[model samples]
Target: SPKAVALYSFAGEESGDLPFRKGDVITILKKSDSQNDWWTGRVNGREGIFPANYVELV
Candidate 1:
């Protein structure tokens, strides 16, 4: 379990969800079961994946 705040803006790809800019924060919901990179989280009314290195735990 984890909760973190976005450290920087991560412009999402057009083929996916929107994006999370700096100052925007999210709560960690899940993590990858294979690689040690991305994390699943929620912000506003959407849930998406982001790099684990993109946020810092709160």
Candidate 2:
């Protein structure tokens, strides 16, 4: 089973209102194995690869 995650603001260069709080519920669809890579995720109606450390599974 998948677990819930937290989404954070990704400021600077092509970013929208992430609509997530420190402890907001999120679903991590996928994760990148490389360092400094983005993770594929889904939040509300949005889905994409976000900065790895920018979010955490809670």
The best candidate in terms of TM-score: 1
Prediction-by-prediction clash tally: 0, 0
* Residue 28 accuracy (lDDT) in model 2: 68
Residue-wise C-alpha lDDT for candidate 2, range 1-58, written one tens digit per residue = 2445554565424453334455556576766675256666666676555666666655
Stretches of candidate 2 off by over 4 Å are 11-22
List ranges where model 1 is wrong by over 4 Å: 14-18, 32-36
Q: TM-scores of the models, in the given order?
A: 0.73, 0.56
lDDT of candidate 2?
0.57
Query: Among all windows of ten consecutive residues in candidate 2, which has the lowest summed lDDT?
Result: 11-20
